[PDB]
Amino acid sequence: AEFVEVEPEAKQEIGSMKFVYKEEHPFEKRRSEGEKIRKKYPDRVPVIVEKAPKARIGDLDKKKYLVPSDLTVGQFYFLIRKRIHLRAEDALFFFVNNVIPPTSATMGQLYQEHHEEDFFLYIAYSDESVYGL
Numbered sequence: 001a002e003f004v005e006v007e008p009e010a011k012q013e014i015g016s017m018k019f020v021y022k023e024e025h026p027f028e029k030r031r032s033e034g035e036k037i038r039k040k041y042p043d044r045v046p047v048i049v050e051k052a053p054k055a056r057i058g059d060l061d062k063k064k065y066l067v068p069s070d071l072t073v074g075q076f077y078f079l080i081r082k083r084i085h086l087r088a089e090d091a092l093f094f095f096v097n098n099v100i101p102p103t104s105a106t107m108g109q110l111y112q113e114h115h116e117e118d119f120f121l122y123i124a125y126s127d128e129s130v131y132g133l
């Protein structure tokens with residue numbers, strides 16, 4: 001009899017966002033890999049990180065990250081900043097399903113709530129605070 005209290009979402013929050021990674025690797029190969037990697041490393045989460053459309057920021061050398069579940073989103077920002085040699089004054093924003101995730105969440109929490117059907121979490125990054133601008 002209790003209502004499910006549905007959490008509000010931003011207007012732009014959209015599932016199944018486009019990533020070049022997903023265009024370049026067939027779904028079932030991604031899914032098979034994601035299942036396997038979750039079993040092999042259960043306290044890590046597999047993450048794809050890609051530059052958002054229209055972003056003006058350096059590209060990462062590598063898209064696939066195997067991340068300790070307890071690492072925070074904030075700690076992950078700092079890791080990515082270093083990987084792309086951001087300057088102190090440079091901005092960095094992450095997006096999951098078009099929405100900036102909470103800096104204080106763990107990567108495991110983010111994964112739990114937002115992983116896709118292939119068992120990966122997808123994060124886009126940008127110099128801008130709105131995905132795709």
